[PDB]
Write a protein that binds this ligand. Structure first.
Ligand SMILES: [Ca+2]
Ligand SMILES: [Ca+2]
Length: 312
């Protein structure tokens, strides 16, 4: 399998569990620090990063009724200046870039308590697909599906429905949506980390997925596996393979990686393209820092880069 070794540039450091890299509508860059603890208790942070100097600014340190959050994944909203954040202890949060947040739901559409979330991906219709590898959200005792298969997948619809679309995953982590050129979402890809598998489903509509199947194989027997993911403009899927020192590159048909990107670190956790560029920012857990490198092409547009009214 061909391997490329692009030059990586250090962006910022000292971000415990560095994750959820994202750009908002204004081009500001943010990352989350899920591993931050205070007195041994969860105290995760959402940070804004100065791309020029690496300066970090805490925009939110979410906590609900005495329980600190573990923000782990992010998605930019197209119609407002807010971030949708997958939180391992609090579930799904909507964070205002100015310093406030709201808990989207304490229970799903079936009245069950929410499970802690890890990452999420907006499809072009505004629906949010979320991975939830953790057990019930706080105040329930923390637990993870690294061994047991109780991790779930949710879809928070544009009409406010928090639907659990599937479950029984062994630590679902990264997630992505493939779209047709007319903007129609038609495939959901879910990473099941420890099993070294990428799963796919045909998307038939909001919160409607079918034809589940194993779509791709993540190289290695190391502890870890597929973490965060994103598509480039040619719909190649780039996947951080935590513990492998590489970011895997899958073609539109999945299977085995078509190429691998060697990283100057062993634990890439996530990645995100800078809008209108080939620059990819990567978060990693070896040094708890953020880096950047140049890919072969621009990234697939994120939901907040799309046209609300279409092409005039
Ligand atoms: Ca993740
Ligand atoms: Ca991303």
């Amino acid at each position: 399998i061909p391997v490329i070794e692009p030059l990586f540039t250090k962006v910022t450091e000292d971000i415990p569990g560095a994750e959820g890299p994202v750009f908002d509508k204004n081009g500001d860059f943010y990352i989350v620090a899920p591993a931050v603890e205070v007195n041994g208790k969860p105290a995760g942070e959402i940070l804004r990063i100065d791309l020029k100097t690496g300066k970090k600014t805490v925009i939110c340190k979410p906590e609900v009724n005495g329980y600190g959050g573990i923000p782990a994944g992010c998605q930019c909203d197209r119609d407002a200046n807010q971030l949708f954040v997958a939180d391992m202890r609090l579930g799904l949060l909507v964070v205002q870039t100015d310093g406030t947040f709201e808990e989207i739901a304490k229970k799903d559409s079936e009245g069950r308590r929410m499970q802690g979330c890890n990452d999420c991906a907006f499809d072009y219709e505004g629906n949010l697909w979320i991975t939830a590898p953790a057990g019930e959200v706080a105040p329930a005792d923390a637990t993870a599906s690294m061994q047991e298969k109780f991790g779930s997948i949710y879809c928070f619809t544009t009409d406010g429905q928090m639907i659990q679309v599937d479950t029984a995953f062994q630590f679902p982590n990264g997630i992505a949506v493939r779209h047709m050129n007319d903007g129609r979402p038609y495939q959901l890809i879910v990473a099941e980390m420890p099993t070294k598998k990428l799963w796919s489903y045909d998307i038939k509509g909001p919160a409607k997925i079918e034809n589940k199947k194993v779509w791709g194989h993540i190289p290695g027997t190391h502890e870890g596996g597929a973490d965060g993911m994103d598509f480039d403009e040619d719909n190649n899927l780039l996947v951080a393979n935590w513990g492998s020192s590489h970011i895997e590159v899958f073609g539109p048909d999945g299977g085995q990686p078509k190429m691998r990107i060697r990283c100057p670190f062993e634990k890439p956790s996530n990645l995100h393209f800078k809008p209108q560029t080939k620059t990819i920012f990567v978060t990693e857990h070896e040094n708890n820092a953020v880096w950047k490198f140049e890919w072969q092409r621009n990234g697939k547009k994120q939901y907040c880069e799309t046209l609300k009214f279409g092409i005039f």
